[PDB]
């Protein structure tokens, strides 16, 4: 259609020109600004896992003597009779 011929010729000289404008990064334009500022495996895991071990075990040793129901571990499930007892079973 001959009507839009002058259309989209100046628009490419405006929209893509704005995209020519939008493509703009003068010498990586981060300043940042101010200020500044593998093998170890020495404290990155030691702060992570090795420190909270002792705290929570203290929270259980100081727990059984206080609460009357500590760990409630089940029965023996033993078919013979053994050295922990005095009798045996066939």
């Amino acid at each position: 259609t001959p009507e839009e011929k002058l259309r989209l010729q100046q628009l490419r000289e405006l929209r893509r020109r704005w995209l020519k404008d939008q493509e703009l990064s003068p010498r990586e334009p981060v300043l940042p600004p101010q200020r500044v500022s593998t093998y170890r495996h020495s404290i990155f895991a030691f702060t992570h896992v090795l420190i909270p071990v002792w705290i929570i075990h203290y929270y259980l040793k100081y727990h059984v003597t206080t609460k009357p129901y500590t760990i409630v571990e089940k029965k023996p499930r033993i078919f013979p009779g053994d050295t922990i007892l005095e009798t045996g079973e066939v």
Partner: peptide, 22 residues
């Protein structure tokens, strides 16, 4: 359809759609 007579006017708006460089 009605724009695609001029075969470069085919090519013109694709860069507007496909967001082509600069």
């Amino acid at each position: 359809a009605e724009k695609l007579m001029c075969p470069q006017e085919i090519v013109d708006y694709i860069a507007d759609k496909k967001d082509v460089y600069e």
